[PDB]
Design a protein around this ligand. Structure first.
Ligand code: CL
Ligand code: CL
Ligand code: CL
Ligand code: CL
Ligand code: ZN
Length: 149
């Protein structure tokens, strides 16, 4: 799989409390100026917002949910792995390396699909980060208890 990037004017973001959660590879100058936390190994960055967001972070162990696929302009039901340490090929965004806290699924993804939200009954689970060959990989956020406190 490889890191996908984002095509189109859609946010690719979770807005919870006074945080914005994005793929690290899509973080803006404003994100880095308002940095709270980032981890390259997870492809995650969190910045601070003035506006209150409405997202709820799931605190479950669900392995089924629904994600948004930008390339197909559709939501899909999906079955995804536990957060895992997966090998990710080189791209414009990272050299080849192991990416942690990544959940793999059989599901459509193309370049430009990063930032699509994965959600379950409990709330937001994660965001598309990687994919290829009929697989999609989601960066989990559910372990970050300080997002929703
Ligand atoms: Cl890294
Ligand atoms: Cl489940
Ligand atoms: Cl969505
Ligand atoms: Cl591939
Ligand atoms: Zn859940």
């Amino acid at each position: 799989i490889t890191t996908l990037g984002k095509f189109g004017q859609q946010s690719g973001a979770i807005y919870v409390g006074n945080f914005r959660v994005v793929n690290r590879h899509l973080a803006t100058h404003n994100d880095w100026a308002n940095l709270v936390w980032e981890d390259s190994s997870r492809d995650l960055l969190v910045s601070s917002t003035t506006a209150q967001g409405c997202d709820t972070i799931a605190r479950c162990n669900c392995q089924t949910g629904v994600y948004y696929c930008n390339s197909m302009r559709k939501h899909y039901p999906v079955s995804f792995s536990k957060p895992s340490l997966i090998f990710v090929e080189a791209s414009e965004y990272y050299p080849a390396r192991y990416q942690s806290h990544l959940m793999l699924a059989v599901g459509h993804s193309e370049p430009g699909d990063a930032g699509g939200i994965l959600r379950c009954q409990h709330g937001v689970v994660g965001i598309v980060s990687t994919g290829g060959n009929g697989l999609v990989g989601f960066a989990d956020v559910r372990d970050l208890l300080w997002l929703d406190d």
